[model samples]
Target chain A: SQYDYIELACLFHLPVKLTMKSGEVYYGVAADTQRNSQKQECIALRGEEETWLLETDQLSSMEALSEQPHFSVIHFK
Target chain B: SQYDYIELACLFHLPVKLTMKSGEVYYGVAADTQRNSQKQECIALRGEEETWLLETDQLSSMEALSEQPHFSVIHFK
Candidate 1:
Protein backbone atom coordinates (compact mmCIF):
# COMPACT_ATOMS: atom_id res chain seq x y z
CA SER A 1 0.00 0.00 0.00
CA GLN A 2 2.27 2.71 1.34
CA TYR A 3 5.36 0.87 0.14
CA ASP A 4 5.19 2.10 -3.40
CA TYR A 5 4.50 5.69 -2.48
CA ILE A 6 7.23 5.68 0.12
CA GLU A 7 9.66 4.21 -2.36
CA LEU A 8 8.64 6.73 -4.97
CA ALA A 9 9.35 9.59 -2.59
CA CYS A 10 12.73 8.13 -1.72
CA LEU A 11 13.58 7.47 -5.34
CA PHE A 12 12.98 11.10 -6.18
CA HIS A 13 14.38 12.50 -2.93
CA LEU A 14 11.17 14.42 -2.55
CA PRO A 15 10.51 16.78 0.30
CA VAL A 16 7.69 15.60 2.47
CA LYS A 17 5.66 16.26 5.58
CA LEU A 18 4.57 13.32 7.66
CA THR A 19 1.89 13.38 10.32
CA MET A 20 1.57 10.65 12.87
CA LYS A 21 -1.57 9.35 14.43
CA SER A 22 -0.30 10.74 17.70
CA GLY A 23 -0.25 14.21 16.13
CA GLU A 24 3.51 14.43 15.84
CA VAL A 25 4.83 15.97 12.66
CA TYR A 26 8.06 15.58 10.73
CA TYR A 27 9.50 17.30 7.72
CA GLY A 28 12.32 15.91 5.64
CA VAL A 29 13.64 14.70 2.39
CA ALA A 30 12.54 11.11 1.86
CA ALA A 31 15.44 8.70 2.11
CA ASP A 32 14.76 4.99 2.53
CA THR A 33 12.84 2.28 4.29
CA GLN A 34 14.40 0.03 6.87
CA ARG A 35 13.33 -2.50 9.42
CA ASN A 36 13.62 -1.36 12.97
CA SER A 37 15.13 -3.55 15.70
CA GLN A 38 11.62 -4.75 16.37
CA LYS A 39 11.24 -5.67 12.70
CA GLN A 40 8.80 -2.92 11.84
CA GLU A 41 9.03 -1.11 8.53
CA CYS A 42 10.28 2.41 9.12
CA ILE A 43 10.64 5.32 6.76
CA ALA A 44 13.95 7.13 7.05
CA LEU A 45 13.48 10.87 7.10
CA ARG A 46 16.48 13.11 6.62
CA GLY A 47 15.85 16.34 8.41
CA GLU A 48 18.09 19.37 8.32
CA GLU A 49 20.14 18.29 11.32
CA GLU A 50 19.11 14.75 12.01
CA THR A 51 17.47 11.65 10.66
CA TRP A 52 14.32 10.03 12.01
CA LEU A 53 13.08 6.53 11.49
CA LEU A 54 9.30 6.57 11.74
CA GLU A 55 7.35 3.40 11.99
CA THR A 56 5.02 3.05 9.07
CA ASP A 57 2.17 1.97 11.24
CA GLN A 58 2.31 5.18 13.19
CA LEU A 59 1.74 7.38 10.22
CA SER A 60 -1.54 9.17 9.64
CA SER A 61 -0.59 10.77 6.33
CA MET A 62 2.28 11.68 4.03
CA GLU A 63 2.27 14.79 1.90
CA ALA A 64 4.71 15.55 -0.88
CA LEU A 65 5.93 19.15 -0.77
CA SER A 66 7.51 19.34 -4.20
CA GLU A 67 5.86 21.68 -6.67
CA GLN A 68 5.57 19.00 -9.29
CA PRO A 69 5.12 15.83 -7.33
CA HIS A 70 3.82 12.79 -9.12
CA PHE A 71 1.23 12.50 -6.38
CA SER A 72 0.01 14.75 -3.66
CA VAL A 73 -1.02 13.18 -0.35
CA ILE A 74 -1.53 9.64 0.91
CA HIS A 75 -3.56 8.72 3.93
CA PHE A 76 -2.42 5.82 6.07
CA LYS A 77 -4.45 5.53 9.19
CA SER B 1 -1.15 8.31 -2.81
CA GLN B 2 -2.11 5.15 -4.67
CA TYR B 3 -0.73 6.52 -7.91
CA ASP B 4 2.66 4.92 -7.47
CA TYR B 5 1.30 1.52 -6.55
CA ILE B 6 -1.18 1.60 -9.40
CA GLU B 7 1.56 2.59 -11.84
CA LEU B 8 3.82 -0.15 -10.53
CA ALA B 9 1.09 -2.73 -11.00
CA CYS B 10 0.61 -1.57 -14.58
CA LEU B 11 4.33 -1.43 -15.24
CA PHE B 12 4.79 -5.02 -14.14
CA HIS B 13 1.43 -6.24 -15.33
CA LEU B 14 0.83 -7.38 -11.80
CA PRO B 15 -2.24 -9.39 -11.00
CA VAL B 16 -4.34 -7.92 -8.20
CA LYS B 17 -7.53 -8.30 -6.25
CA LEU B 18 -9.45 -5.12 -5.57
CA THR B 19 -12.33 -4.50 -3.24
CA MET B 20 -14.57 -1.48 -3.32
CA LYS B 21 -16.48 0.25 -0.54
CA SER B 22 -19.73 -0.94 -2.01
CA GLY B 23 -18.53 -4.55 -1.71
CA GLU B 24 -17.73 -4.99 -5.38
CA VAL B 25 -14.70 -7.14 -6.07
CA TYR B 26 -12.42 -7.04 -9.10
CA TYR B 27 -9.61 -9.31 -10.14
CA GLY B 28 -7.27 -8.59 -12.99
CA VAL B 29 -3.89 -7.57 -14.28
CA ALA B 30 -3.41 -3.83 -13.91
CA ALA B 31 -2.96 -2.16 -17.27
CA ASP B 32 -3.03 1.59 -16.94
CA THR B 33 -4.48 4.70 -15.30
CA GLN B 34 -6.58 7.20 -17.15
CA ARG B 35 -8.96 10.06 -16.55
CA ASN B 36 -12.63 9.30 -16.63
CA SER B 37 -15.13 11.50 -18.46
CA GLN B 38 -15.83 13.18 -15.13
CA LYS B 39 -12.10 13.84 -14.65
CA GLN B 40 -11.54 11.22 -11.99
CA GLU B 41 -8.46 8.99 -12.04
CA CYS B 42 -9.39 5.47 -12.98
CA ILE B 43 -7.30 2.32 -12.99
CA ALA B 44 -7.62 0.06 -16.01
CA LEU B 45 -7.83 -3.58 -15.03
CA ARG B 46 -7.70 -6.33 -17.60
CA GLY B 47 -9.99 -9.09 -16.53
CA GLU B 48 -10.22 -12.59 -17.95
CA GLU B 49 -12.73 -11.54 -20.57
CA GLU B 50 -13.26 -7.86 -20.11
CA THR B 51 -11.53 -4.69 -19.06
CA TRP B 52 -12.77 -2.46 -16.26
CA LEU B 53 -11.78 1.06 -15.42
CA LEU B 54 -12.10 1.46 -11.64
CA GLU B 55 -12.10 4.82 -10.02
CA THR B 56 -9.28 4.93 -7.50
CA ASP B 57 -11.56 6.73 -5.06
CA GLN B 58 -13.90 3.78 -4.86
CA LEU B 59 -11.24 1.27 -3.89
CA SER B 60 -11.26 -0.09 -0.37
CA SER B 61 -8.14 -2.18 -0.80
CA MET B 62 -5.78 -3.72 -3.35
CA GLU B 63 -4.00 -7.03 -2.89
CA ALA B 64 -1.22 -8.26 -5.11
CA LEU B 65 -1.80 -11.81 -6.29
CA SER B 66 1.58 -12.55 -7.85
CA GLU B 67 3.91 -14.91 -6.06
CA GLN B 68 6.88 -12.56 -6.46
CA PRO B 69 5.11 -9.29 -5.91
CA HIS B 70 7.12 -6.23 -4.93
CA PHE B 71 4.72 -5.76 -2.03
CA SER B 72 1.87 -7.71 -0.58
CA VAL B 73 -1.48 -6.16 0.34
CA ILE B 74 -2.02 -2.43 0.47
CA HIS B 75 -4.87 -0.89 2.43
CA PHE B 76 -6.55 2.08 0.76
CA LYS B 77 -9.56 2.90 2.86
Candidate 2:
Protein backbone atom coordinates (compact mmCIF):
# COMPACT_ATOMS: atom_id res chain seq x y z
CA SER A 1 0.00 0.00 0.00
CA GLN A 2 2.85 2.38 0.78
CA TYR A 3 4.47 2.90 -2.58
CA ASP A 4 6.77 5.53 -1.15
CA TYR A 5 8.41 3.17 1.29
CA ILE A 6 10.95 0.63 0.13
CA GLU A 7 12.69 -1.98 2.29
CA LEU A 8 16.42 -2.58 1.86
CA ALA A 9 19.23 -4.39 3.73
CA CYS A 10 22.84 -3.15 3.98
CA LEU A 11 25.94 -5.10 5.04
CA PHE A 12 28.87 -3.34 6.74
CA HIS A 13 32.37 -4.56 7.55
CA LEU A 14 33.86 -3.48 10.87
CA PRO A 15 37.56 -2.86 11.38
CA VAL A 16 37.12 -4.61 14.69
CA LYS A 17 34.60 -7.10 16.00
CA LEU A 18 32.25 -5.32 18.38
CA THR A 19 31.51 -7.50 21.38
CA MET A 20 28.57 -6.62 23.52
CA LYS A 21 28.46 -7.49 27.20
CA SER A 22 25.74 -9.95 26.24
CA GLY A 23 28.23 -11.66 23.91
CA GLU A 24 26.73 -10.87 20.53
CA VAL A 25 28.48 -9.54 17.43
CA TYR A 26 26.14 -6.84 16.21
CA TYR A 27 26.78 -5.87 12.61
CA GLY A 28 25.77 -3.22 10.14
CA VAL A 29 27.77 -0.08 9.30
CA ALA A 30 30.28 1.91 11.32
CA ALA A 31 30.79 5.56 12.20
CA ASP A 32 34.20 6.96 11.49
CA THR A 33 35.54 8.08 14.86
CA GLN A 34 39.01 8.75 13.41
CA ARG A 35 40.52 7.57 16.67
CA ASN A 36 41.63 3.95 16.52
CA SER A 37 40.22 2.87 19.88
CA GLN A 38 36.91 4.34 20.83
CA LYS A 39 33.54 3.29 22.19
CA GLN A 40 30.07 4.37 21.16
CA GLU A 41 29.41 4.30 17.41
CA CYS A 42 26.59 5.57 15.20
CA ILE A 43 25.02 5.24 11.72
CA ALA A 44 22.39 7.09 9.69
CA LEU A 45 19.46 6.01 7.49
CA ARG A 46 16.96 8.20 5.69
CA GLY A 47 13.29 8.04 4.66
CA GLU A 48 11.55 4.71 5.22
CA GLU A 49 14.86 3.00 5.84
CA GLU A 50 15.71 5.63 8.39
CA THR A 51 12.46 5.12 10.22
CA TRP A 52 12.85 1.36 9.90
CA LEU A 53 16.34 1.35 11.40
CA LEU A 54 15.32 3.73 14.17
CA GLU A 55 12.30 1.61 15.06
CA THR A 56 14.43 -1.49 14.84
CA ASP A 57 16.91 0.04 17.23
CA GLN A 58 14.13 0.83 19.63
CA LEU A 59 13.00 -2.79 19.45
CA SER A 60 16.52 -4.14 19.89
CA SER A 61 19.77 -2.37 20.71
CA MET A 62 21.53 -5.20 18.91
CA GLU A 63 19.99 -4.01 15.70
CA ALA A 64 21.34 -0.57 16.48
CA LEU A 65 24.80 -2.06 16.66
CA SER A 66 24.32 -3.32 13.14
CA GLU A 67 24.12 0.25 11.93
CA GLN A 68 26.52 1.64 14.48
CA PRO A 69 29.23 4.14 13.52
CA HIS A 70 27.13 5.18 10.51
CA PHE A 71 30.19 6.71 8.92
CA SER A 72 31.65 3.36 7.85
CA VAL A 73 29.53 2.49 4.80
CA ILE A 74 27.52 4.15 2.00
CA HIS A 75 23.73 4.31 1.61
CA PHE A 76 22.33 2.53 -1.48
CA LYS A 77 19.04 1.04 -0.59
CA SER B 1 28.50 25.77 -12.65
CA GLN B 2 30.28 24.90 -9.44
CA TYR B 3 28.15 26.97 -7.10
CA ASP B 4 28.81 25.73 -3.57
CA TYR B 5 29.37 22.36 -5.21
CA ILE B 6 25.64 21.80 -5.05
CA GLU B 7 24.82 19.13 -7.58
CA LEU B 8 21.12 18.31 -7.32
CA ALA B 9 21.83 15.03 -9.02
CA CYS B 10 24.15 14.17 -6.15
CA LEU B 11 21.11 13.39 -4.06
CA PHE B 12 18.99 10.41 -5.08
CA HIS B 13 17.70 7.10 -3.71
CA LEU B 14 20.30 4.65 -4.86
CA PRO B 15 20.08 1.02 -3.77
CA VAL B 16 23.45 -0.69 -3.83
CA LYS B 17 24.18 -4.39 -4.33
CA LEU B 18 27.65 -5.48 -3.19
CA THR B 19 28.81 -8.96 -4.19
CA MET B 20 31.89 -10.55 -2.67
CA LYS B 21 34.14 -13.48 -3.53
CA SER B 22 32.31 -15.67 -1.01
CA GLY B 23 29.07 -15.01 -2.86
CA GLU B 24 27.90 -12.77 -0.08
CA VAL B 25 25.46 -9.92 -0.59
CA TYR B 26 26.11 -6.46 0.81
CA TYR B 27 23.45 -3.89 0.16
CA GLY B 28 23.02 -0.29 1.38
CA VAL B 29 22.78 3.36 0.36
CA ALA B 30 25.93 4.93 -1.07
CA ALA B 31 27.23 7.55 1.37
CA ASP B 32 30.31 9.71 1.85
CA THR B 33 32.34 8.28 4.70
CA GLN B 34 33.93 11.68 5.21
CA ARG B 35 30.52 12.92 6.27
CA ASN B 36 27.90 11.50 8.60
CA SER B 37 25.80 8.78 6.99
CA GLN B 38 22.62 10.71 7.75
CA LYS B 39 24.01 13.82 6.13
CA GLN B 40 25.38 11.88 3.15
CA GLU B 41 22.22 9.86 2.52
CA CYS B 42 19.97 12.57 1.06
CA ILE B 43 19.69 16.29 0.48
CA ALA B 44 16.91 18.85 0.40
CA LEU B 45 16.61 20.31 -3.08
CA ARG B 46 15.14 23.75 -3.61
CA GLY B 47 12.57 22.79 -6.27
CA GLU B 48 12.80 19.24 -7.43
CA GLU B 49 9.91 16.85 -7.97
CA GLU B 50 12.08 13.79 -7.45
CA THR B 51 14.54 12.90 -4.69
CA TRP B 52 18.15 12.06 -5.50
CA LEU B 53 20.35 9.31 -4.06
CA LEU B 54 24.14 9.88 -3.75
CA GLU B 55 26.43 6.87 -3.80
CA THR B 56 30.13 6.02 -3.06
CA ASP B 57 32.49 3.31 -1.72
CA GLN B 58 36.17 2.33 -1.32
CA LEU B 59 38.67 -0.22 -2.68
CA SER B 60 38.57 -3.89 -1.50
CA SER B 61 41.31 -5.80 0.20
CA MET B 62 42.18 -9.19 1.73
CA GLU B 63 41.16 -8.53 5.32
CA ALA B 64 38.60 -6.02 4.20
CA LEU B 65 35.59 -6.80 2.02
CA SER B 66 36.21 -4.03 -0.50
CA GLU B 67 37.67 -0.57 -0.31
CA GLN B 68 35.57 0.29 -3.35
CA PRO B 69 32.27 -0.72 -1.74
CA HIS B 70 30.49 2.35 -3.03
CA PHE B 71 27.38 2.16 -5.30
CA SER B 72 24.00 3.91 -5.90
CA VAL B 73 20.43 3.78 -7.35
CA ILE B 74 18.29 6.83 -8.16
CA HIS B 75 14.50 7.14 -8.15
CA PHE B 76 12.80 6.91 -11.55
CA LYS B 77 13.26 10.24 -13.33
Candidate 3:
Protein backbone atom coordinates (compact mmCIF):
# COMPACT_ATOMS: atom_id res chain seq x y z
CA SER A 1 0.00 0.00 0.00
CA GLN A 2 2.99 2.27 -0.25
CA TYR A 3 1.36 3.46 -3.47
CA ASP A 4 -1.04 5.34 -1.19
CA TYR A 5 1.99 7.09 0.19
CA ILE A 6 1.54 9.43 -2.73
CA GLU A 7 -1.95 10.22 -1.53
CA LEU A 8 -0.77 10.62 2.07
CA ALA A 9 1.74 13.20 0.95
CA CYS A 10 -1.16 15.44 -0.02
CA LEU A 11 -1.87 16.00 3.68
CA PHE A 12 1.12 18.21 4.14
CA HIS A 13 0.56 21.45 6.10
CA LEU A 14 -2.70 20.29 7.63
CA PRO A 15 -3.15 21.00 11.34
CA VAL A 16 -2.98 17.89 13.50
CA LYS A 17 -2.09 16.62 16.94
CA LEU A 18 -0.18 13.44 17.60
CA THR A 19 -0.03 11.44 20.83
CA MET A 20 3.08 9.38 21.34
CA LYS A 21 3.65 6.21 23.33
CA SER A 22 4.63 7.99 26.54
CA GLY A 23 1.56 10.26 26.28
CA GLU A 24 3.60 13.14 24.90
CA VAL A 25 1.50 15.32 22.61
CA TYR A 26 2.56 17.20 19.49
CA TYR A 27 0.06 19.70 18.21
CA GLY A 28 0.66 21.66 15.05
CA VAL A 29 0.59 21.61 11.27
CA ALA A 30 1.70 18.55 9.31
CA ALA A 31 4.64 19.85 7.36
CA ASP A 32 6.09 16.92 5.47
CA THR A 33 7.23 13.32 5.45
CA GLN A 34 10.79 13.00 6.60
CA ARG A 35 12.59 9.82 5.76
CA ASN A 36 15.93 8.69 7.16
CA SER A 37 18.64 7.46 4.81
CA GLN A 38 17.60 3.89 5.59
CA LYS A 39 13.92 4.53 4.70
CA GLN A 40 12.53 4.88 8.20
CA GLU A 41 9.18 6.73 8.15
CA CYS A 42 8.98 10.06 9.93
CA ILE A 43 6.51 12.91 10.18
CA ALA A 44 7.39 16.55 10.44
CA LEU A 45 5.21 18.29 12.99
CA ARG A 46 5.56 22.00 12.71
CA GLY A 47 4.73 24.06 15.74
CA GLU A 48 4.90 27.71 14.82
CA GLU A 49 8.56 27.80 13.78
CA GLU A 50 9.93 24.73 15.57
CA THR A 51 9.64 21.52 13.56
CA TRP A 52 10.01 18.08 15.08
CA LEU A 53 10.81 15.01 13.01
CA LEU A 54 9.22 12.10 14.78
CA GLU A 55 9.11 8.48 13.74
CA THR A 56 5.72 7.28 12.51
CA ASP A 57 5.57 4.34 14.88
CA GLN A 58 6.02 6.63 17.85
CA LEU A 59 2.55 7.97 17.49
CA SER A 60 -0.17 6.18 19.45
CA SER A 61 -2.93 8.38 18.07
CA MET A 62 -3.49 11.33 15.76
CA GLU A 63 -6.12 14.03 15.57
CA ALA A 64 -6.74 15.94 12.40
CA LEU A 65 -7.71 19.29 13.83
CA SER A 66 -10.05 21.53 11.91
CA GLU A 67 -9.53 25.20 11.12
CA GLN A 68 -9.91 25.97 14.81
CA PRO A 69 -8.90 24.28 18.03
CA HIS A 70 -12.49 23.55 19.01
CA PHE A 71 -13.21 21.85 15.72
CA SER A 72 -10.68 19.05 15.96
CA VAL A 73 -11.45 15.54 14.72
CA ILE A 74 -10.18 11.99 15.18
CA HIS A 75 -9.38 10.27 11.89
CA PHE A 76 -9.78 6.60 12.78
CA LYS A 77 -12.78 5.17 14.58
CA SER B 1 -18.84 9.48 10.86
CA GLN B 2 -21.10 11.81 8.91
CA TYR B 3 -18.65 14.56 9.73
CA ASP B 4 -16.41 12.93 7.13
CA TYR B 5 -19.13 13.35 4.56
CA ILE B 6 -17.56 16.54 3.28
CA GLU B 7 -14.22 14.85 2.95
CA LEU B 8 -15.76 11.81 1.26
CA ALA B 9 -17.35 14.09 -1.31
CA CYS B 10 -13.89 14.74 -2.69
CA LEU B 11 -13.84 11.17 -3.99
CA PHE B 12 -16.52 11.97 -6.53
CA HIS B 13 -15.91 10.47 -9.96
CA LEU B 14 -13.33 8.08 -8.53
CA PRO B 15 -13.44 4.46 -9.62
CA VAL B 16 -15.07 2.10 -7.11
CA LYS B 17 -16.62 -1.34 -6.67
CA LEU B 18 -19.37 -1.90 -4.13
CA THR B 19 -20.21 -5.45 -2.98
CA MET B 20 -23.61 -5.71 -1.46
CA LYS B 21 -25.45 -8.40 0.52
CA SER B 22 -25.26 -11.94 -0.76
CA GLY B 23 -22.12 -11.27 -2.80
CA GLU B 24 -23.82 -8.76 -5.13
CA VAL B 25 -21.20 -6.45 -6.60
CA TYR B 26 -21.30 -2.94 -8.07
CA TYR B 27 -18.38 -1.82 -10.14
CA GLY B 28 -18.39 1.72 -11.50
CA VAL B 29 -17.14 5.26 -11.05
CA ALA B 30 -18.20 7.06 -7.88
CA ALA B 31 -20.32 9.90 -9.24
CA ASP B 32 -22.22 11.53 -6.37
CA THR B 33 -24.12 11.16 -3.08
CA GLN B 34 -27.85 10.85 -3.60
CA ARG B 35 -29.81 11.97 -0.54
CA ASN B 36 -33.52 11.69 0.09
CA SER B 37 -35.86 14.34 1.47
CA GLN B 38 -34.98 13.37 5.01
CA LYS B 39 -31.60 11.68 5.57
CA GLN B 40 -30.34 8.52 3.94
CA GLU B 41 -27.01 7.38 2.63
CA CYS B 42 -26.96 6.83 -1.13
CA ILE B 43 -24.08 6.43 -3.50
CA ALA B 44 -24.22 7.23 -7.21
CA LEU B 45 -22.40 4.70 -9.37
CA ARG B 46 -21.92 5.64 -12.99
CA GLY B 47 -21.14 3.30 -15.86
CA GLU B 48 -20.29 5.29 -18.96
CA GLU B 49 -23.88 6.45 -19.64
CA GLU B 50 -26.02 4.74 -17.03
CA THR B 51 -26.00 5.90 -13.41
CA TRP B 52 -27.11 3.78 -10.47
CA LEU B 53 -28.13 5.10 -7.03
CA LEU B 54 -27.51 2.44 -4.43
CA GLU B 55 -28.14 2.57 -0.70
CA THR B 56 -25.03 2.77 1.44
CA ASP B 57 -26.27 0.01 3.74
CA GLN B 58 -26.65 -2.35 0.82
CA LEU B 59 -22.96 -2.16 0.08
CA SER B 60 -20.70 -4.85 1.48
CA SER B 61 -17.66 -3.68 -0.44
CA MET B 62 -16.24 -0.68 -2.35
CA GLU B 63 -13.17 -0.68 -4.53
CA ALA B 64 -11.59 2.43 -5.92
CA LEU B 65 -10.46 1.32 -9.34
CA SER B 66 -7.32 2.84 -10.76
CA GLU B 67 -7.22 4.70 -14.08
CA GLN B 68 -6.53 1.35 -15.71
CA PRO B 69 -8.90 -1.32 -14.45
CA HIS B 70 -5.98 -3.46 -13.34
CA PHE B 71 -4.80 -0.84 -10.84
CA SER B 72 -8.07 -0.85 -8.92
CA VAL B 73 -8.09 -0.41 -5.08
CA ILE B 74 -10.16 -1.40 -2.10
CA HIS B 75 -10.93 1.74 -0.06
CA PHE B 76 -11.92 0.40 3.40
CA LYS B 77 -9.20 -2.13 3.91
Q: Rate the local accuracy (lDDT) of all candidates.
A: 0.80, 0.28, 0.57
Measured with C-alpha atoms, the lDDT of residue B28 in candidate 3 is 56
Model 2, position A48, has a per-residue lDDT of: 23
Q: What does candidate 2's lDDT look like per residue over A1-77, in tens digits? A: 11101122223323222334445444433323221123222332322222112222222222332333333233122
Give the higher-TM-score candidate: 1 or 2: 1
Q: Please give the lDDT score for candidate 3.
A: 0.57
Instruction: Give the chain A TM-score for each candidate.
Output: 0.89, 0.21, 0.66
DockQ of each: 0.04, 0.09, 0.04
After superposing all C-alphas onto the true structure, candidate 3 shows an RMSD in angstroms of 12.4
Given candidate 1, what's the lDDT at residue A38?
A: 90
User: Which candidate wins on TM-score?
Assistant: 1
Model 2 misplacement above 4 A: A1-4, A7-77, B1-10, B19-25, B32-57, B60-77
Q: Tell me the spans in candidate 1 whose CA falls farther than 4 Å from its real position.
A: A1-3, B1-77
Tens-place lDDT per residue, model 1, A1-77, is 22366755664567999999999999999988788889999999999899999998999999977764256898885
The predicted structure with the larger DockQ, 1 or 2, is 2
Tens digits of per-residue lDDT for model 2, B4-63: 111222233233443334444344433222333555533221111122332222212112
lDDT of 3 by residue, B41-67 (tens): 778765433567777766665665444
